Design a protein around this motif. Structure first.
Motif, PDB file in Angstrom:
ATOM      1  N   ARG A 154       0.816  -1.223   0.000  1.00 11.13           N
ATOM      2  CA  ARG A 154       0.000   0.000   0.000  1.00 11.13           C
ATOM      3  C   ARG A 154       0.849   1.273   0.000  1.00 11.13           C
ATOM      4  O   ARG A 154       0.423   2.316  -0.490  1.00 11.13           O
ATOM      5  CB  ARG A 154      -0.949   0.014   1.188  1.00 11.13           C
ATOM      6  N   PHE A 155       2.080   1.133   0.519  1.00  6.40           N
ATOM      7  CA  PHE A 155       3.063   2.198   0.524  1.00  6.40           C
ATOM      8  C   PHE A 155       3.999   2.065  -0.682  1.00  6.40           C
ATOM      9  O   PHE A 155       3.690   2.637  -1.760  1.00  6.40           O
ATOM     10  CB  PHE A 155       3.833   2.159   1.821  1.00  6.40           C
ATOM     11  N   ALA A 156       5.124   1.341  -0.527  1.00 11.29           N
ATOM     12  CA  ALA A 156       6.249   1.439  -1.469  1.00 11.29           C
ATOM     13  C   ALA A 156       5.910   1.024  -2.909  1.00 11.29           C
ATOM     14  O   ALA A 156       6.599   1.439  -3.832  1.00 11.29           O
ATOM     15  CB  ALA A 156       7.437   0.647  -0.991  1.00 11.29           C
TER      16      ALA A 156
ATOM     17  N   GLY B 264       3.489   2.236  -4.563  1.00  7.52           N
ATOM     18  CA  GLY B 264       3.174   3.507  -5.213  1.00  7.52           C
ATOM     19  C   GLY B 264       4.345   3.952  -6.097  1.00  7.52           C
ATOM     20  O   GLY B 264       4.233   4.010  -7.335  1.00  7.52           O
ATOM     21  N   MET B 265       5.475   4.278  -5.469  1.00  5.41           N
ATOM     22  CA  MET B 265       6.702   4.595  -6.185  1.00  5.41           C
ATOM     23  C   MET B 265       6.974   3.513  -7.242  1.00  5.41           C
ATOM     24  O   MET B 265       6.821   3.761  -8.447  1.00  5.41           O
ATOM     25  CB  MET B 265       7.879   4.762  -5.214  1.00  5.41           C
ATOM     26  CG  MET B 265       9.181   5.167  -5.908  1.00  5.41           C
ATOM     27  SD  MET B 265      10.434   3.863  -6.301  1.00  5.41           S
ATOM     28  CE  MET B 265      11.505   4.160  -4.920  1.00  5.41           C
TER      29      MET B 265
ATOM     30  N   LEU C  27       3.793   2.737  -9.984  1.00  4.73           N
ATOM     31  CA  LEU C  27       3.192   3.944 -10.520  1.00  4.73           C
ATOM     32  C   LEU C  27       4.216   4.860 -11.151  1.00  4.73           C
ATOM     33  O   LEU C  27       4.260   5.023 -12.380  1.00  4.73           O
ATOM     34  CB  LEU C  27       2.424   4.681  -9.405  1.00  4.73           C
ATOM     35  CG  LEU C  27       1.177   4.105  -8.795  1.00  4.73           C
ATOM     36  CD1 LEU C  27       0.692   4.938  -7.604  1.00  4.73           C
ATOM     37  CD2 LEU C  27       0.109   4.077  -9.889  1.00  4.73           C
ATOM     38  N   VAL C  28       5.069   5.403 -10.293  1.00  2.00           N
ATOM     39  CA  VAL C  28       5.955   6.530 -10.656  1.00  2.00           C
ATOM     40  C   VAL C  28       6.779   6.144 -11.879  1.00  2.00           C
ATOM     41  O   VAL C  28       6.665   6.757 -12.954  1.00  2.00           O
ATOM     42  CB  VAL C  28       6.904   6.873  -9.522  1.00  2.00           C
ATOM     43  CG1 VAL C  28       7.822   7.962  -9.973  1.00  2.00           C
ATOM     44  CG2 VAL C  28       6.116   7.422  -8.321  1.00  2.00           C
TER      45      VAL C  28
ATOM     46  N   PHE D 137       4.557   5.209 -15.403  1.00  2.20           N
ATOM     47  CA  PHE D 137       4.009   6.264 -16.243  1.00  2.20           C
ATOM     48  C   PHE D 137       5.042   7.330 -16.552  1.00  2.20           C
ATOM     49  O   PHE D 137       4.980   7.972 -17.620  1.00  2.20           O
ATOM     50  CB  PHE D 137       2.716   6.850 -15.659  1.00  2.20           C
ATOM     51  CG  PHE D 137       2.854   7.280 -14.265  1.00  2.20           C
ATOM     52  CD1 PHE D 137       3.796   8.265 -13.910  1.00  2.20           C
ATOM     53  CD2 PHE D 137       2.029   6.759 -13.311  1.00  2.20           C
ATOM     54  CE1 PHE D 137       3.954   8.674 -12.627  1.00  2.20           C
ATOM     55  CE2 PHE D 137       2.169   7.199 -12.010  1.00  2.20           C
ATOM     56  CZ  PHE D 137       3.127   8.138 -11.670  1.00  2.20           C
TER      57      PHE D 137
ATOM     58  N   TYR E  12      12.666  24.034 -29.670  1.00  2.00           N
ATOM     59  CA  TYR E  12      13.712  24.782 -28.950  1.00  2.00           C
ATOM     60  C   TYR E  12      14.984  23.959 -28.731  1.00  2.00           C
ATOM     61  O   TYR E  12      15.605  24.057 -27.672  1.00  2.00           O
ATOM     62  CB  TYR E  12      13.164  25.285 -27.608  1.00  2.00           C
ATOM     63  CG  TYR E  12      11.689  25.635 -27.642  1.00  2.00           C
ATOM     64  CD1 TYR E  12      10.729  24.669 -27.325  1.00  2.00           C
ATOM     65  CD2 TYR E  12      11.244  26.907 -28.032  1.00  2.00           C
ATOM     66  CE1 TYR E  12       9.384  24.958 -27.349  1.00  2.00           C
ATOM     67  CE2 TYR E  12       9.904  27.200 -28.061  1.00  2.00           C
ATOM     68  CZ  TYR E  12       8.976  26.237 -27.691  1.00  2.00           C
ATOM     69  OH  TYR E  12       7.633  26.503 -27.677  1.00  2.00           O
ATOM     70  N   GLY E  13      15.371  23.157 -29.725  1.00  2.00           N
ATOM     71  CA  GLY E  13      16.453  22.193 -29.561  1.00  2.00           C
ATOM     72  C   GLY E  13      17.472  22.258 -30.667  1.00  2.00           C
ATOM     73  O   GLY E  13      17.251  22.836 -31.728  1.00  2.00           O
TER      74      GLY E  13
ATOM     75  N   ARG F 279      19.792  16.431 -31.750  1.00  2.00           N
ATOM     76  CA  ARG F 279      18.346  16.207 -31.604  1.00  2.00           C
ATOM     77  C   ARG F 279      18.003  14.726 -31.716  1.00  2.00           C
ATOM     78  O   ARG F 279      17.380  14.131 -30.820  1.00  2.00           O
ATOM     79  CB  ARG F 279      17.571  17.009 -32.664  1.00  2.00           C
ATOM     80  CG  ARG F 279      16.200  17.497 -32.229  1.00  2.00           C
ATOM     81  CD  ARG F 279      16.292  18.899 -31.638  1.00  2.00           C
ATOM     82  NE  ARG F 279      16.636  19.902 -32.645  1.00  2.00           N
ATOM     83  CZ  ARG F 279      15.767  20.534 -33.431  1.00  2.00           C
ATOM     84  NH1 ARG F 279      14.454  20.294 -33.340  1.00  2.00           N
ATOM     85  NH2 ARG F 279      16.205  21.429 -34.312  1.00  2.00           N
TER      86      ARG F 279
ATOM     87  N   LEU G 263     -11.549   6.079 -32.465  1.00  2.00           N
ATOM     88  CA  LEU G 263     -11.706   7.413 -31.910  1.00  2.00           C
ATOM     89  C   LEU G 263     -12.693   8.219 -32.723  1.00  2.00           C
ATOM     90  O   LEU G 263     -13.721   8.685 -32.206  1.00  2.00           O
ATOM     91  CB  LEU G 263     -10.349   8.149 -31.861  1.00  2.00           C
ATOM     92  CG  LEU G 263      -9.719   8.353 -30.494  1.00  2.00           C
ATOM     93  CD1 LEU G 263      -8.641   9.430 -30.607  1.00  2.00           C
ATOM     94  CD2 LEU G 263     -10.768   8.754 -29.454  1.00  2.00           C
TER      95      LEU G 263
END
Lengths: 399, 399
Positions: free
Chosen positions: B158-160, B162-163, B166-167, B170, B187-188, B193, B329
């Motif tokens: 439920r805690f770790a 997440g990181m 999830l993090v 995505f 702007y590159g 590039r 779509l």
């Protein structure tokens, strides 16, 4: 009825979120001495009075904060006294507004809006995104100031803080930009499009909080912040006048209220005034600020790292609506792809050489100066004067 | 030298990531019996042979997986045997490719690419994003299959988690779309590039993994999957032929190798072939797949929820390069804003009534049928035949 109801519904929500944000910004910055709701009163009371503009901006919160640094470190002013120290500060503040007043207000129109404000609006968003990142940092170990040796803290840091700060913050940022964007979203229904667009930020409050919950000599020395706050609020509060009464369509008053809300526990807000005016060309503040009286009990009922998703979001929001940022990008941009950018009404034909757009370096230099100075006292005192010393003077110097 | 070096450098990286992804997709789906590197061999060996296409696609991994379901539940085939059960399956598979071979290959060009493949490419990405979400779910409680009663599991969920999931997932998705996007980023700098664009996906491996680390009767019954896999690989592996030898510019062979890599422990990959060909109009597989031999030791040295950021990313990547999705779509789109979409070469003037674009409903119906069927056995067996029964027939039925 239904006609004013719509602007009040919209503007209430768009005004409360930063005000409660700055509110708990004080619940944390001022060690809990200044709460989230005490910020709501400094908007609701004055809004209910008026016989948009009115609110609590981040200069208010930053100089409230600096006042906290002025009193907490100095030997015997500490805390608890601070509540009224704001009062005797608002004495000199009120009197500075009274002395300058409409007489000084007559002169404000020409300099600030045309060249200078672009630095203001960027320093706000700069320090605002910074104080969003500090809010990201708050979701780990700051609990010490909140309490000692608590069940929460141990493995809610390197672990649960990930979710906490990270997820809900940036997730709110992205999904909340749906507010500014959803009008021209192609694959959508026009009847409800602006339902999801206009209220997209507080709708994202509910979405992301459903995703979250899924789991005295000194009193003489008080003339300085009053005198400076004068020149600051003459810019902001009268920019509300320059922006509500635009070319598309009681300037003193403030002082009278400064003594009021100073003795108990406001300005013309930059982003909020313009949204209020376009409703009548296709009275009303009491309804909104009455429902901000409802937001005094709703910040209670309401009852959080999403907030910093706002701090950073609301920091980012004034990027496109800022031509000095379009200049900072199109300054650090490249030479060859610049030609492909053909849209850019700010450059124009007369100064077709990019060396004629070269000065931005000095606007930038003055800003980075002021920001390098804001993070320290003494200079964190003198940041509006940095504006006045330099920028009203340079207008003649420019070419 | 330097000329082939560039395509080998690029294509090696763009080929390994999904192959190691499907690899640990087997480390998890097949309970650890089929590893991340055993998937790397089924690309590297055959690639080094050839006397792009070649790789391991998700139909390979999905029918490997289904074979696992065919053997694990049936009373006495269980596990450990499975390693060679793939061998005797590849006997019938090889012989199906041999029986049909070039003779059958002559007929493939006309039907599939023009109308049918658009359903293929979307079912892959559909089930691929699903098996990215299951990978998001894996970063909490799946550790049971990984081990029992371990220090990690308790408050890393439920805690770790997440990181963890999830993090990095995505975050990799968004920052990794920089690969497809960075060519026309305004702007590159043009000299580097495409350095950041082309290698943006594996560069985001390193970025996001720096951000991460910041803290027998049945043997007779084996003719069915062989016969079906035949008609499947005649579509995929020969679509590599239809896409490498496009209008812009040993078809049997596979069987010979199926017996090989079946006995030890591949196809023409849809996304990978086209990127290989455009280099020579402005030999080479051995260099790449040699460095995939280096990726056999580099998946070792390499040594993770970012991966699912890929599964979902690489699932999303084939959305714009799919006109049936542009149709799904622009099918669930709105009536009035549709007029503002003026760009859309697929609708064209001849069928200006949107009711002439109405059929997509039946492509969709057949796909949702096949996907509702893929999640279950028996029908999870018969999903390419669903294609053959329905779609080659409908071409005459259409108007």
């Amino acid at each position: 009825g239904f006609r004013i109801l719509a602007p009040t519904t919209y503007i209430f929500f768009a005004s409360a979120i930063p005000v409660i944000s700055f509110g708990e910004q004080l619940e944390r910055s001022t060690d809990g001495v200044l709460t989230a709701v005490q910020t709501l009163a400094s908007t609701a009371i004055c809004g209910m009075i008026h016989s948009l503009i009115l609110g609590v901006a981040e200069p208010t919160v930053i100089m409230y904060t600096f006042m906290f640094n002025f009193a907490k470190a100095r030997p015997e002013l500490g805390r608890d006294l601070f509540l009224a120290w704001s009062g005797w500060v608002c004495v000199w503040t009120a009197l500075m507004l009274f002395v300058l007043a409409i007489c000084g207000a007559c002169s404000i129109i020409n300099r600030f809006t045309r060249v200078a404000g672009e630095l203001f609006g960027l320093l706000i968003a700069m320090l605002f995104m910074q104080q969003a990142i500090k809010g990201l940092v708050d979701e780990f170990r700051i609990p010490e100031r909140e309490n000692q040796k608590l069940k929460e803290f141990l493995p809610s840091w390197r672990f649960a803080n990930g979710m906490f700060a990270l997820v809900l913050s940036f997730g709110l940022l992205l999904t909340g930009l749906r507010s500014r964007k959803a009008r021209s979203w192609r694959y959508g229904t026009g009847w409800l499009r602006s339902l999801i667009a206009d209220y997209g930020v507080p709708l994202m409050v509910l979405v992301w909080t459903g995703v979250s919950y899924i789991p005295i000599v000194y009193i003489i020395g008080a003339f300085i912040p009053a005198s400076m706050i004068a020149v600051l609020y003459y810019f902001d509060h009268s920019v509300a006048s320059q922006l509500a009464q635009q070319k598309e369509f009681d300037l003193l008053l403030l002082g009278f209220l400064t003594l009021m809300c100073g003795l108990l526990g406001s300005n013309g807000v930059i982003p909020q005034s313009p949204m209020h005016t376009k409703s009548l060309a296709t009275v009303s503040n009491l309804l909104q600020s009455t429902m901000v009286g409802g937001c005094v009990a709703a910040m209670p009922i309401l009852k959080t790292s999403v907030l910093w998703g706002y701090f950073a979001f609301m920091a980012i929001e004034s990027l496109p609506g800022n031509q000095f940022w379009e200049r900072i990008l199109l300054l650090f941009t490249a030479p060859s792809r610049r030609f492909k950018v053909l849209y850019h009404a700010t450059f124009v034909e007369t100064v077709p050489f990019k060396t004629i757009a070269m000065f931005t370096l000095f606007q930038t230099t003055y800003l980075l100066i002021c920001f390098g100075l804001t993070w320290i006292p003494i200079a964190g005192v003198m940041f509006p004067l940095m504006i006045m010393f330099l920028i009203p003077v340079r207008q003649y110097l420019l070419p």
